[PDB]
């Protein structure tokens, strides 16, 4: 039909249909994960795969003067040597978020629950651009948003 079996022969290639690239924070908002979602998936099984590729709204700089939030791509879940206090879950893990090429671990607690903006998107865009990394395609976004609904439901 559409998603029927696993079509995985992608070492490199040209994706059809969602062949264009995400240039809207809105599409990044459907694949956007908030800490609330992470919180509820915190106790769940291997969600790390599902969240990998999806984007989270992390705030870096949000503490001093202006609420600075940026788009960060989730690159897996790593463990921390110290469990933190979050909406009541207790977890010693984090995701490896990435802004362009900024691969860094952030705790669920630093994550936003608000929506993305053009300012945030463009800032991530400049990070990816400055990294030489390409923006994701709408196919990926589709696969992520679909994976999201399968994770929650």
Curated annotation (Swiss-Prot):
Record domain Plus3: where: 22-153
Gene of this entry: RTF1
Protein name as it appears in the record: RNA polymerase-associated protein RTF1 homolog
Ranges that cross the membrane: none
Subunit description: Component of the PAF1 complex, which consists of CDC73, PAF1, LEO1, CTR9, RTF1 and SKIC8; the association of RTF1 appears to be less stable than that of other subunits. At least in HeLa cells a N-terminal shorter form of RTF1 is also found in the complex. The PAF1 complex interacts with PHF5A.
Localization (cell): Nucleus, Nucleoplasm
Entry remark concerning the domains of this protein: The Plus3 domain mediates single-stranded DNA-binding.
Function: Component of the PAF1 complex (PAF1C) which has multiple functions during transcription by RNA polymerase II and is implicated in regulation of development and maintenance of embryonic stem cell pluripotency. PAF1C associates with RNA polymerase II through interaction with POLR2A CTD non-phosphorylated and 'Ser-2'- and 'Ser-5'-phosphorylated forms and is involved in transcriptional elongation, acting both independently and synergistically with TCEA1 and in cooperation with the DSIF complex and HTATSF1. PAF1C is required for transcription of Hox and Wnt target genes.
